[PDB]
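okkk here we go again. third time trying to get the calcium ion bound version out, last two times i messed up the smiles copy paste (missing a bracket lol). double checked this time i swear
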Amino acid sequence: IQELILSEENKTNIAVLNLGTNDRRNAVLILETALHLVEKYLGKIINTSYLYETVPYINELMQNLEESKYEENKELIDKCEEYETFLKNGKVDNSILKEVNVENYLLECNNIIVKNDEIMKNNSYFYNLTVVVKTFVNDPLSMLVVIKYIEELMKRIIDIDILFFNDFTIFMKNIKLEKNMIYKILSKYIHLQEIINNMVDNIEFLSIPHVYTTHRYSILLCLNDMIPEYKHNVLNNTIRCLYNKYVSRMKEQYNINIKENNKRIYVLKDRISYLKEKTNIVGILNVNYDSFSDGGIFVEPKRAVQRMFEMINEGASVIDIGGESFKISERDLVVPVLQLFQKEWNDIKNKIVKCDAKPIISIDTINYNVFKECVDNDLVDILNDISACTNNPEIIKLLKKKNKFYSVVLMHKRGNPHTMDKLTNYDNLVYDIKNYLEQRLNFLVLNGIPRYRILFDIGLGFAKKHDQSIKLLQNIHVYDEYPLFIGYSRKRFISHCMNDKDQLLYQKNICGGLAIASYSYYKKVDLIRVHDVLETKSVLDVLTKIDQVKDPNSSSVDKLAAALE
Amino acid sequence: QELILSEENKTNIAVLNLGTNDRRNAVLILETALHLVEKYLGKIINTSYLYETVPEVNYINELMQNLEESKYEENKELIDKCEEYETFLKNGKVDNSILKEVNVENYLLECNNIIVKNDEIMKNNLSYFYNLTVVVKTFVNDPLSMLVVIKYIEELMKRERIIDIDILFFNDFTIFMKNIKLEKNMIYKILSKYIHLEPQEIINNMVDNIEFLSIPHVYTTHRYSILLCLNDMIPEYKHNVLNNTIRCLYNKYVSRMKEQYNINIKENNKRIYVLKDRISYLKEKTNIVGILNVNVEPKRAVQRMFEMINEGASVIDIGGESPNPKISERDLVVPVLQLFQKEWNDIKNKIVKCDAKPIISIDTINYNVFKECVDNDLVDILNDISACTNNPEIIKLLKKKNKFYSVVLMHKRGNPHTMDKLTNYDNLVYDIKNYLEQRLNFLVLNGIPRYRILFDIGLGFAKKHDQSIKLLQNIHVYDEYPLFIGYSRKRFISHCMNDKDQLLYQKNICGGLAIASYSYYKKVDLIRVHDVLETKSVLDVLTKIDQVKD
Ligand SMILES: COc1ncnc(NS(=O)(=O)c2ccc(NCC3=Nc4c(nc(N)[nH]c4=O)NC3)cc2)c1OC
Ligand SMILES: COc1ncnc(NS(=O)(=O)c2ccc(NCC3=Nc4c(nc(N)[nH]c4=O)NC3)cc2)c1OC
Ligand SMILES: Nc1ncnc2c1ncn2[C@@H]1O[C@H](COP(=O)(O)O)[C@@H](O)[C@H]1O
Ligand SMILES: Nc1ncnc2c1ncn2[C@@H]1O[C@H](COP(=O)(O)O)[C@@H](O)[C@H]1O
Ligand SMILES: [Ca+2]
Ligand SMILES: [Ca+2]
Ligand SMILES: [Mg+2]
Ligand SMILES: [Mg+2]
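finally!!
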């Protein structure tokens, strides 16, 4: 019924979308622009999967955008009933579109694939990300209209499909839309010309669940991040069970490991990172230590920015700056130093020789006010929050802006520098800490921090005995699935693992450090937060070389050649 | 009668088993046997490794001073071939046995009877073993005579249980003799054919202890420990009475133990190498070798040595070579080692600190230097960067009436000026390995215990930087062998990185520590380094991470 598609009785529905692009260079910019528009025109993003590389400007737009009929709020949430109900297949309001039969849907899907399987033989990088939206849109077909519009607004390849919509089984085998009925639907949610034309024909049909849902690997891979337990009448088994079957079966039958050519992405600034493919160095700039070790009482902002440069040319991708330490204010330590850096940089950016050399800037803070000022003056790109956004969750709201997002590091601790040493009792150390972080992430994701921008840090030496810091290292494979940031540098636990008497122990500690760096390298930790950037980079370089083999067959081939001589 | 005291000068090949189970004196006992073997039976021309195997103190020093002279001569000349040993390896043509031979059938019957009877004996009867094998070119006439002499040695070594020497093979003979009762006269009479005998108390305790002779020895096919050792020495050997080659037999014994009992027998039967006089379990530790270049006043040098022990180095490797014509290698190194020997000795009232004595390794290719060192008990290991290629005479100095000495064999080409040009290899990784193997075979032919030989790929000697890295990447190739390496402060390290240039010294030290990491996980046996504290700190931490607490 066309009349209740336009009726302004606003509804709350659960949609799950696929979002893809081809443009490797700017997948992060493309998909994050989609993402922000999805958050604008459809509802609130309440889940996301990792970004994946898979195998089968707009800065002008972001100012000239029309408003929406519905108000957004950055406000934090704890749960979601709508969502809770989506996952178990509890009762929801009836489909205001025609539901095709259960057993009818099966054969219907086939013909759209097998026919497309022929259009194929007329005849290469995909970048996938799935989302969940709490939608004020009232029906899939309406949303598709808006999705098509969003698609169109971004053109001068950005496919945004729709994978599910409540528990509905829908096929509309052949529809065309009124060149005008679109205007009505669009004006329903948006405040409005030259675009609608190219739209009208681009909505040839509609399948919920989307056709390729369980045939495309890239979609299972993504859906498994977000909603593993979810079942649907439409499919035999739960999304995790199907995903697993696709893996095992791809191995038994075709002798391929599918995970190799389909990679997980985490994002530090604006660029793609292949989970587990590198160990990045993070250089510690502690303004307290740098300033008050002379025994001196003054900040030396010029000194600090120099140390910042030292660090960059010593091979650190990320610099992590901190005002807290373990009568002058945190902010007054950090912001001026971040300020002098930003300037000093742009006064050598003229030489575009250092333009793709610019280091990522991470602020170690639990303070909202400090973070706000930093973001507001484009001074940082990552929040490093040792309280896991526990000291003040509101800080999460500062991790998303008009278009752009910021990546966060979440660390586990108990208590504080003075109290933590005795807060050492765990039921199950490794798993408690893992579960802790998995949960902070869930919370960030529920609030539409994109899953692929959150990094775990086990917090070595925070509320952990030296034996515990070791145990956490021994079991680091538990973070095999996740971006992992760690910080062993200079901590006392290193020394404890060892059989003028006070200067030896700093060498022993820095050198013992370099061991954990090696271990980190082989365990494929994602970032390590270090003081001794040159020493670390050296170690890492030698280890990388030893690993870069020219021919991966050569040792057997060569072995045989010897045996025949 | 006496076709057994025949005047005809016999050269035969006998393969021997040497077993003990005093872990703390394992080396001394076994080598003491090895010596009396060389003294009294003939010439050692192969040995296996040493193994801690799963079943089935100082009067030795007094013994060795007062041995009877052998009536057979000792010839330390280098040989590079042995016809009789080739004759034995192939299964070809030797003289008839003067002892009555049995056919295959009768041996297998009589073999089996001894096993089953000895099984039920063990079964109703209610502790590792240290194991080794040797091939002896022997002047003893026949296995029985030999068993007599080898019993004398078992007896000699007992205090007026400690060792068991058994004949595994003896030429290609099959021999089963059931009821050996040997006249008290006949024993004195055999022994005296091979030994200038001075007594006769022990001759008594010998009369009983020889009851029967089996050749091959009975448990040859039956004990892992035996097959394991033989696998080192004589893979291809196939005795008439054996189902297959030693190697085949070994593999089968291994693979059958993986299924029929699901065991994986390797795990509890460990290969052993020796640096000074203790046991080392191959691949169980990464020792640090401290570099001392006397390139340095004697007192400043010995200072450096004590600092290095405290920074936690197990071996020091002292070197005169790098040259300069002013002072001779001898005059650089010998003083230093003499000062060290003395100054350590002044602390010879602290009978606890004197376990932490470092093994001393002289980096030298010159006979004269090593001779002076060895003569004055100044060193334990010879680090010959030429693989004893330069002057093989040196090999003669790696053994004495009593001591044996371990040797690192490095691969290099040419000399320091030439070497940067001698850089073409057909199959780098295997060329070098094969080179080292041949070298080993040469010392082993020449009586050097195979467990005293350490292999070293010689990084940065006649290798381009990429080649030094290629070798490290393929270090797994030396999984079976004692492995010594030196990467320390070499140029290839710096080459990997992407460019006060005391800075470049650092990147090199620090990249050094990456290689220590890789060495540790690739279980390299020894690493020779300048930076002992830094190397120890890496290894200590990595070791902690690995040690899983309960
Ligand atoms: C005797 O008294 C003491 N003296 C010195 N150090 C002590 N503690 S410690 O060495 O174990 C140690 C050192 C530093 C820290 N914190 C440094 C940071 N660590 C991290 C970070 N961010 C992220 N994401 N992860 C991090 O691990 N920011 C700062 C924690 C423990 C100490 O005991 C309390
Ligand atoms: C003559 O020209 C040169 N001068 C300085 N550096 C050079 N390059 S280098 O740094 O790579 C280098 C440095 C030292 C060495 N040799 C040191 C040793 N190395 C070992 C040892 N013993 C054992 N067993 N194993 C060892 O690896 N003794 C001494 C080899 C290559 C160089 O050649 C291009
Ligand atoms: N679940 C869905 N989400 C988006 N488009 C759909 C869906 N089911 C069917 N379609 C139709 O299939 C086409 C999508 O193909 P594409 O060009 O890859 O976006 C559009 O014409 C849609 O009308
Ligand atoms: N090939 C052999 N090597 C050593 N002993 C042997 C051999 N063949 C038979 N025997 C006898 O087996 C017993 C070994 O005793 P034991 O050396 O105490 O284990 C002695 O009675 C020897 O006479
Ligand atoms: Ca919204
Ligand atoms: Ca001899
Ligand atoms: Mg589509
Ligand atoms: Mg015996």
